Structures are given as structure tokens and as C-alpha cells.
Design a protein around this ligand. Structure first.
Ligand SMILES: [Fe+3]
Ligand SMILES: [Zn+2]
Ligand SMILES: [Zn+2]
Ligand SMILES: [Zn+2]
Ligand SMILES: [Zn+2]
Length: 60
């Protein structure tokens, strides 16, 4: 499947999940990383999207 991916802020550890989005900022569940506008930042420390690393997750 086109699995939904997890991305971890390299500065504070916050994790964005494509499956959940970030509704408080208008980012719908299912929003893929490349489709998030660049005005968005880590909600917990302000780091830019470029400061995230994709997380490898196990099969489910
Ligand atoms: Fe952060
Ligand atoms: Zn797959
Ligand atoms: Zn896209
Ligand atoms: Zn915006
Ligand atoms: Zn940065």
C-alpha cells in the first residue's frame, strides 16, 4: 500500500503522522508530507519541514 508515513522533528522529537494530519493548522488527515505548505513548522519548537526525518515503521 501507499502507507502513511511518520516524520520526526530532529530538534524536539515531535512526530507528524500523514494519517492524522494537523487539523489545528488546517492540515487534513491524509496530507502527504510534500503537500504540506512550507509556511508550516513543527508545532512544538518551530523548526521547518526541512528539519524532519522520515521514521521507519513496522508492518501492521
Ligand atoms: Fe520540533
Ligand atoms: Zn505498500
Ligand atoms: Zn504531492
Ligand atoms: Zn498556511
Ligand atoms: Zn532549521
Amino acid at each position: 500500500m501507499n502507507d502513511y508515513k511518520l516524520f520526526r522533528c530532529i530538534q524536539c522529537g515531535f512526530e507528524y503522522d500523514e494519517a492524522l494530519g494537523w487539523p489545528e493548522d488546517g492540515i487534513a488527515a491524509g496530507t502527504r508530507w510534500d503537500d504540506i505548505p512550507d509556511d508550516w513548522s513543527c508545532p512544538d519548537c518551530g523548526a521547518a519541514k526541512s528539519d524532519f526525518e522520515m521514521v521507519e515503521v513496522a508492518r501492521s
